[PDB]
Amino acid sequence: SQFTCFYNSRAQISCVWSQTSCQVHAWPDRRRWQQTCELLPVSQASWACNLILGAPDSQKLTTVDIVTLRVLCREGVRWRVMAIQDFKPFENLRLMAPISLQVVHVETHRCNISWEISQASHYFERHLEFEARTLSPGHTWEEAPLLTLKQKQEWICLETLTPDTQYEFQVRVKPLQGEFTTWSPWSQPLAFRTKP
Amino acid sequence: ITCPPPMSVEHADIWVKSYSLYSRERYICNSGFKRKAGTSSLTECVLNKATNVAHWTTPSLKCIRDP
Amino acid sequence: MGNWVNVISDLKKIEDLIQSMHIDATLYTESDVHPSCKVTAMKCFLLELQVISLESGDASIHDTVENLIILANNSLSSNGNVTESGCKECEELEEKNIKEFLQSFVHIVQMFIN
Amino acid sequence: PLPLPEVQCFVFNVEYMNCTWQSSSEPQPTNLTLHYWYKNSDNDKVQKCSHYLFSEEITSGCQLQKKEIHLYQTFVVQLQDPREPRRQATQMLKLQNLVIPWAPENLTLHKLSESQLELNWNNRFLNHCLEHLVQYRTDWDHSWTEQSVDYRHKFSLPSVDGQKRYTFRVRSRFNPLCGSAQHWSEWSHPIHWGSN
Ligand SMILES: *[C@@H]1O[C@H](CO)[C@@H](O[C@@H]2O[C@H](CO)[C@@H](O)[C@H](O)[C@H]2NC(C)=O)[C@H](O)[C@H]1NC(C)=O
Ligand SMILES: *[C@@H]1O[C@H](CO)[C@@H](O[C@@H]2O[C@H](CO)[C@@H](O)[C@H](O)[C@H]2NC(C)=O)[C@H](O)[C@H]1NC(C)=O
Ligand SMILES: *[C@@H]1O[C@H](CO)[C@@H](O)[C@H](O)[C@H]1NC(C)=O
Ligand SMILES: *[C@@H]1O[C@H](CO)[C@@H](O)[C@H](O)[C@H]1NC(C)=O
Structure with missing residues (x-):
């Protein structure tokens, strides 16, 4: 029914397949290697696995590369192709969540928070953007305003905060390139307090 | 552990400073010749871990007539 | 732009990687590219880039050089069947260290980008 | 001699x-x-x-x-x-x-959302050969806050003190895609937002 994959811009392709032994096969149009991962149930109706193409920060694909991705399922004495896709890696980017969130400095009404990105290709340079949100005491994550950073800025200075107050903070990252490119997962929330 | 004298490369000479393991040496194309672009004059004494003998790496060097 | 922009990025990565390395090879380097021979000069840079790869013994160098060449060749194929004439052979170029070679490599790529 | x-x-x-x-x-x-x-x-x-x-x-x-x-x-x-x-x-x-480009011009601000601002500008020059430095400050600030920007030439400020008057200015440099100039252009004509 659905075969969806994302490239982390380095050496990992994450695949989900919805619809009993199945796997994803990767066949690149101009590389010597091939890759396979065993699809595992992540729910009752979906399977997933990661294609590992190399070391965490290796650059295994470019915009020129086309990788043929196939879902193969064992049916008795015979294998079958359940889904196929000519994967253009940089058209289907999804990065890892931002990491290493920390408070740079906190005041009574202000707070500067920084983070880093993980396994993001050097090809991006500064062609990246971020979104952040702050969890307030009497509200939930879904109620939190999406803060937009339309440049590669790995920090934010939250203004108009309330003294002596607990907050939580999340940030996600996205490259500007790629038709099907989507946001990274949210980072782990960072908890902090404004000064009294 | 030392390496034997390197094999000769056509139209090139080599003056090894050290025959010991891990040493890096470089072939020099003779007069009237040039290193072909894309080819390397580097060779080094590595270890054949399978046979415990040291040998110079085979260079890709091609010495062509000076254009 | 496009592919050449990525080529710049790869060139900068190679520059970074080779810092902690000892690659004393001399490379044919066109520091003064004539616009009528720019494609020929580019192909000489691409060829000599392979020497850096071979002499490195480093996997990150291998990947990046291979990536750069893929990207570069993809752009040169799109440039049409424009043949250049009266251009020097790669072996006629001045020989220089990795530092100057990479610097001039960046110089010609910037020219293509602009 | x-x-x-x-x-x-x-x-x-x-x-x-x-x-x-x-x-x-x-x-x-x-x-x-x-x-x-x-x-x-x-x-x-x-x-x-x-x-x-x-x-x-x-x-x-x-x-x-x-x-x-x-x-x-x-x-x-x-x-x-x-x-x-x-x-x-x-x-x-x-x-x-x-190469030293002319200062950016036609700086504009518009409200992206509550307490969020987006700065836009123009350059009398091919866009992708330029990088930019955005600076902003309130009347209280001792010095300017700054953030680099690439050839996208947009800038978002996700957290704005509504009780303060902001000043924005931008400068540009011929770097690094078409050249590697170290010198920057002069500062753009500044613009203000809000009031004290
Ligand atoms: C919030 O903290 C960040 C991280 O220290 C600051 O960003 C740095 O600013 C300096 C000076 O411009 C730069 O040299 C660094 O490169 C920046 N670091 C990063 C990760 O970008 C930022 O200036 C602080 N914000 C405020 C308003 O003080
Ligand atoms: C480039 O040099 C020219 C010539 O000196 C400069 O033009 C002069 O600018 C000031 C304006 O008052 C005066 O000395 C003359 O009116 C101008 N001379 C001319 C037009 O011949 C120009 O400023 C310089 N460019 C820059 C950006 O420094
Ligand atoms: C310099 O040149 C100007 C213009 O030709 C001339 O008027 C002036 O006398 C010269 N100054 C000298 C020769 O010291
Ligand atoms: C600045 O804006 C004016 C219109 O108000 C326009 O005529 C001019 O071309 C703009 N400058 C640039 C560099 O686009």
């Missing part, structure tokens, strides 16, 4: 180039001569400066027009003292590292 002053050339927005030198610190007043050519290409012929610049009635520089500018071929200038021909100096310059 008394050393000649150093010639400094800057290419302003690739529209013209001023090549100047400090006329002072000279025992005898002299109109220094300038010649130029380009290495390789079809411009390797010695040219006389056709537009001398003067400070205190003596030559202090030379100006070249757009048609005489070649960014990717080495520029060669020869400074010489006509009263003492032995005093001759040659400089070889890379003009792609010496």
Whole structure:
């Protein structure tokens, strides 16, 4: 029914397949290697696995590369192709969540928070953007305003905060390139307090 | 552990400073010749871990007539 | 732009990687590219880039050089069947260290980008 | 042989180039001569400066027009003292590292959302050859807050103190895609938002 994959811009392709032994096969149009991962149930109706193409920060694909991705399922004495896709890696980017969130400095009404990105290709340079949100005491994550950073800025200075107050903070990252490119997962929330 | 004298490369000479393991040496194309672009004059004494003998790496060097 | 922009990025990565390395090879380097021979000069840079790869013994160098060449060749194929004439052979170029070679490599790529 | 002053050339927005030198610190007043050519290409012929610049009635520089500018071929200038021909100096310059664009213009602000602002601007220059530095401050701030921007030439401020007056300014540099200039343009005309 659905075969969806994302490239982390380095050496990992994450695949989900919805619809009993199945796997994803990767066949690149101009590389010597091939890759396979065993699809595992992540729910009752979906399977997933990661294609590992190399070391965490290796650059295994470019915009020129086309990788043929196939879902193969064992049916008795015979294998079958359940889904196929000519994967253009940089058209289907999804990065890892931002990491290493920390408070740079906190005041009574202000707070500067920084983070880093993980396994993001050097090809991006500064062609990246971020979104952040702050969890307030009497509200939930879904109620939190999406803060937009339309440049590669790995920090934010939250203004108009309330003294002596607990907050939580999340940030996600996205490259500007790629038709099907989507946001990274949210980072782990960072908890902090404004000064009294 | 030392390496034997390197094999000769056509139209090139080599003056090894050290025959010991891990040493890096470089072939020099003779007069009237040039290193072909894309080819390397580097060779080094590595270890054949399978046979415990040291040998110079085979260079890709091609010495062509000076254009 | 496009592919050449990525080529710049790869060139900068190679520059970074080779810092902690000892690659004393001399490379044919066109520091003064004539616009009528720019494609020929580019192909000489691409060829000599392979020497850096071979002499490195480093996997990150291998990947990046291979990536750069893929990207570069993809752009040169799109440039049409424009043949250049009266251009020097790669072996006629001045020989220089990795530092100057990479610097001039960046110089010609910037020219293509602009 | 008394050393000649150093010639400094800057290419302003690739529209013209001023090549100047400090006329002072000279025992005898002299109109220094300038010649130029380009290495390789079809411009390797010695040219006389056709537009001398003067400070205190003596030559202090030379100006070249757009048609005489070649960014990717080495520029060669020869400074010489006509009263003492032995005093001759040659400089070889890379003009792609010496481009100084005009200041950004037409800065605009618009509300993206509650307490969020987006800054836009224009440059009289090809976009992708430029990088940018955005600066903002409130009237209370001791110094400017700054953030780099690439050729996207947009900037978002996700957290804005509504009780304070902000000032924004932007500058640009010919770096790093078409050249590697170190010098920045002058600051744009600044704009303000809100009030105290
Ligand atoms: C919030 O903290 C960050 C991280 O220290 C600051 O960003 C740095 O600013 C300096 C000065 O411009 C730069 O040299 C660094 O490169 C920046 N670091 C990063 C990760 O970008 C930022 O200036 C602080 N914000 C405020 C308003 O003080
Ligand atoms: C490039 O040099 C020219 C010539 O010196 C500069 O133009 C001068 O600018 C000031 C404006 O008051 C005056 O000295 C003259 O009116 C101008 N001279 C002219 C037009 O021939 C120009 O400013 C220089 N460019 C830059 C950006 O420094
Ligand atoms: C320099 O040149 C100007 C213009 O030709 C001339 O008026 C002036 O007398 C000269 N100064 C000298 C020769 O010192
Ligand atoms: C600035 O805006 C004006 C219109 O208000 C326009 O005429 C001009 O071209 C703009 N400048 C640039 C560099 O686009």
